[PDB]
Amino acid sequence: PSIKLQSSDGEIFEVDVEIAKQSVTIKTMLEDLGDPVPLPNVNAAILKKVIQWCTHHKDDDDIPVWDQEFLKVDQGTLFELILAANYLDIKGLLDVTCKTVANMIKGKTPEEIRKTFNIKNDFTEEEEAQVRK
């Protein structure tokens, strides 16, 4: 009913084995060694927001209203969030965070999406559009 977590930058976090169970990769960390559990790929800032999301979804389309305000982060941290979610295997966080990025692309022009994501215009020949295929 209580477990210690260590981020990449030394910091220790204490959370209930209950909310720290949604993360399938560290839920599998009861067995196989049961003195925190080391997380080399997440920094402290992100691991915080990770447990925070998980303590809102302890029990438990359009994406819930809280998650929307919760993911009102800067772009860099969204990236950090889908990687943490993927790293930690929190299916709910990944779906919602990918959904959030998708919504950024939804209905936009190629030019507009290159701007919002700082992607370069790769193309060498004329950009011919496909409709339905």
Binding site: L78, F79, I105, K106, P110, R114, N118, I119, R132
Partner: protein
């Protein structure tokens, strides 16, 4: 220079892209950059969208194609049972007293077993009664290159019966048509004697490997009695369908 979502690992960029409507994926996303073009033209994106939407029934002739065909799979005939009246049907020939829409089970006819959302049928009279639809394939969402190269299965189905108290006849003609409405394939039944005992019959045909150029499907069918009585003693038709199979 800051580039976050973009340097995203492929399986994760895939999850983001899978969230988007196939239509935008093909039209806008493909045009963003060369990495995205390659993903949109690839199998994994669409394989992902398929399993996500329950469509998966390893490899494919085209997973993107599978996806559009699967989502777009529906009966292309208007009003197949008579719920509207003769609406949606063209080249309607009213022989004798003409077509009449009636409720199941008929007077002296058997129940429609095979699907019980089907509640009505069209009844023919004492001269040939006919009706047709011409389906514009591109208008229904099947693009030229799919039609000319994949040539996906065009499945045609019909149901007919007669009264137990009167002999009747049935006819079906389905044509695949060029852009210019020249005939490229034809499935014809000839005149079929409806079962004696009023049991519903299904006629089915699948067109495959039909060559390039198919743009329209012409569905035509007809019925009449073989006893020449006033009223509606001829063949009964219902639950007609045409669709393209993924």
């Amino acid at each position: 220079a800051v580039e976050y979502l973009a340097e995203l690992p492929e399986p994760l960029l895939l999850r983001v892209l899978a969230e988007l409507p196939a239509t935008e994926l093909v039209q806008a996303c493909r045009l963003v950059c060369l990495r995205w073009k390659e993903l949109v033209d690839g199998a994994p994106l669409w394989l992902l969208k398929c399993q996500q939407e329950g469509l998966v029934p390893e490899e494919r002739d085209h997973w993107q194609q599978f996806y559009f065909l699967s989502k777009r799979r529906r009966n292309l005939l208007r009003n197949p049972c008579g719920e509207e009246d003769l609406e949606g049907w063209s080249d309607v020939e009213h022989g004798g007293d003409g077509w009449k829409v009636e409720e199941l089970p008929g007077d002296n006819g058997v129940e429609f077993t095979q699907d019980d959302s089907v509640k009505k049928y069209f009844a023919s009279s004492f001269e040939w009664c006919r009706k047709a639809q011409v389906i514009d394939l591109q208008a229904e969402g099947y693009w030229e290159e799919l039609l000319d190269t994949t040539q996906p299965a065009i499945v045609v189905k019909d149901w007919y019966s007669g009264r137990t108290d009167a002999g009747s006849l049935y006819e079906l003609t389905v044509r695949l048509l060029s852009e210019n409405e020249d005939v490229l394939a034809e499935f014809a039944t000839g005149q079929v004697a409806v079962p004696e005992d009023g049991s519903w019959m299904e006629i089915s045909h699948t067109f495959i490997d039909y060559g390039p150029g198919v743009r329209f499907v012409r569905f035509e069918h007809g019925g009449q009695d073989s006893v020449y009585w006033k009223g509606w003693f001829g063949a009964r038709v219902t639950n007609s369908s045409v669709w393209v199979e993924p």
